[PDB]
Each structure stands twice: as C-alpha cells, then as structure tokens.
Amino acid sequence: AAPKNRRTIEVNRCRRRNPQKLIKVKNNIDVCPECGHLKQKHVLCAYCYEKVCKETAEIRRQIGKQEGGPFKAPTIETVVLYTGETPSEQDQGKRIIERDRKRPSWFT
C-alpha cells in the first residue's frame, strides 16, 4: 500500500503532461451581435442576460410595492409600460404595474 519507490521527476512529468490530462482547447466562441461580448454557442449572452435580470428584478420590486404584503397572487394578467405610452385599448382590465423608465432598444 505504501510507496516502495518514489516516482522520478521524469515519470511525474510524463504523468502530468499527456494530452489526456491537459486542458482540451475549445472552438465554440462566437461574437454576440448585441454589445459584442463574445458569447458561446447554444448559450445566451452575458451583458444582455445581466440587463434582463436587472429588468426582471426591478419589475418584481415594483410588483411587490404595488401588491403590498405577501400571500396575494391576484387572478389577473399583467402589462408593463414606460414613460408616457397610453395603455393599450386591448388590455384595459389587466392591472398595470410600472413607475418611471424609458423603453429600451430591445423591448416590445
């Protein structure tokens, strides 16, 4: 069980230098059309994902401020708006949740 002979530096090098253990190079790094932050295939961007996360967090904070206490969950849909923008004539009963913000160049 115990080492009968210490491994030589040559053996150690040959063990810790073969291609099987070396980090395999990858070639799945493209250029994201948005903000060019070199994204990966089959994976979303980084800056766009952070922006979406921040927007969702702000929307959730606004909903909580409007909803109030916990244990609510109304049975009505939601509609997000921005500075100005008259509410859509189709969504009149849906509770509107917004505050102050400008529509970015990627939100419908």
Residues lying near other proteins in the complex (CB under 8 A) are found at 16, 22-23, 25-26, 29, 31, 33-36, 38, 40, 42-49, 52, 55-56, 59-60, 71-80, 106-108
Whether residue 45 is annotated as binding a ligand: the answer is: yes
Long-range contacts of 14-17 (CB under 8 A, 24+ apart): none
Q: How far apart are CA 84 and CA 99, in angstroms?
A: 10
Side-chain half-sphere of 10: how many Cα atoms within 13 Å?
0
**Does residue 85 interact with Zn ion by CB under 5 A?**
no
Return residues touching Zn ion (CB under 5 A).
32, 34-35, 45, 48
Known binding positions for Zn(2+): 32, 35, 45, 48
